[PDB]
Amino acid sequence: KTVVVTTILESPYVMMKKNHEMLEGNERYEGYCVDLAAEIAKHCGFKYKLTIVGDGKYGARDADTKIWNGMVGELVYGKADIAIAPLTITLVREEVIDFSKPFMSLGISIMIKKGTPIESAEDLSKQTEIAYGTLDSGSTKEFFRRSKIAVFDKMWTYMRSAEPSVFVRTTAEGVARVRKSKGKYAYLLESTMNEYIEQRKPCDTMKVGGNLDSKGYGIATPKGSSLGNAVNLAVLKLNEQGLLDKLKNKWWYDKGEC
Amino acid sequence: KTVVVTTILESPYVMMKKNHEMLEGNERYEGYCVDLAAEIAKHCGFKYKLTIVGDGKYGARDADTKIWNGMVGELVYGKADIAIAPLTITLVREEVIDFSKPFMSLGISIMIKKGTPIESAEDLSKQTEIAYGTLDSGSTKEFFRRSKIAVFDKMWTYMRSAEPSVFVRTTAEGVARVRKSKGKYAYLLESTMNEYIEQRKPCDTMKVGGNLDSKGYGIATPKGSSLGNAVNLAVLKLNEQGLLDKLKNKWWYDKGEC
Ligand SMILES: CC(C)(C)c1onc([O-])c1C[C@H]([NH3+])C(=O)[O-]
Ligand SMILES: CC(C)(C)c1onc([O-])c1C[C@H]([NH3+])C(=O)[O-]
Q: Which positions are annotated as binding L-glutamate (chain B)?
């Protein structure tokens, strides 16, 4: 009965509340997806338990074992009933799990330490002094791996064989790398996160250029789940009521530090 | 075996080709949705016939008769197998027809004749000199009718009883009204159309302020339709290959013009 929700510790979607060490269950967390989960459960009429994904990954199919990891894996193998996180709707994923219509729109973007002489993806691909990478096991990495667009294919061929590795395990690692590399590392991540980080101290990073593509985040459920329909309608209702815009303003700018 | 596609004459989505009088079938038309339709059909493996919606409407449920009109109506009552056009994904529509994930992201926006002293929805609501309205039988009108955001509800309250009516039968009517009203009429329509018009002669209109909401267009099919799955996957694949961005750049090609 209690719906098992798989999510990921990614600010400001899901974060440990200040006094979390002495809190239990859902009360240990806070964030945009924590609020969204509450709204969805309310509209769909179910109780739930937020559970952080074991491997801390979004979801990718291992070319080798052919096994799915991350939150996608938790759904595919029946460990969770639903995923409420900034999970990107993609073709390979839609083939194994279901997604509600988007609750947020975004696109891949470039994050630089302020002052870095880079304005676009093309700029990056035409130089080698500044390294650049992306997150492991995510849609952004897969985007570059599959891209047939000249500039992106060129960037991928570079990234895939760069040393030391330009790929990071978590968004926090990528942000730290941009911040500590004196402008010698640029990070590729989704726009809304780029935007969120530009609002965090020490306010030394920024988004450059336009988005490389246009996609959306969706609430995912196992293929053919009984929750699919109700969740989808709930997301549409919440968006039309303006709750999603409200949630965005709350966690991004009302709590901004720059 | 031929799929009946319902669509609407709306530039640059679907337009009559030059010399269309001597052409027949699908060859009579050109535009973003015409090209999209060709791509979708190619990926899903089906032949199709483009048909222009009889009442020239997007789709709304008649308050009193309880009857869906426009392209939504054509799907609901079995007149068409699929709708390929700038049809907004909404809750009320999703309750009676199915939508693929969005193939385009956009939002409601404001169109003013250049020079109009208006910069936002709030500016519009705080005055009465400049009349403002929207398209009938569409998602934008329903947005205001149902919005509880003070500003939008305030706008709805004024629009509902203004004289002469601020609502128009077609987009062309609303645009023409902005252009002929010497700045005394502002029009509410979706962003990508506003931007399309802003780049064409006589170059006397412009989009002002940010978008009022965020949403997308989706390819629609009757509820439970067998075509649903394939069309959805096709849209995701086309977006991931960059075809959707290519079509946008093609039909919004900065035409020479302003
Ligand atoms: C952390 C976040 C969300 C900003 C992100 O930035 N680049 C990515 O690949 C992802 C993960 C992506 N949303 C997914 O679902 O794989
Ligand atoms: C004409 C177009 C497409 C610019 C538009 O702009 N405001 C609207 O309401 C619509 C129609 C809407 N997409 C729908 O499906 O009702």
A: 139-140, 190
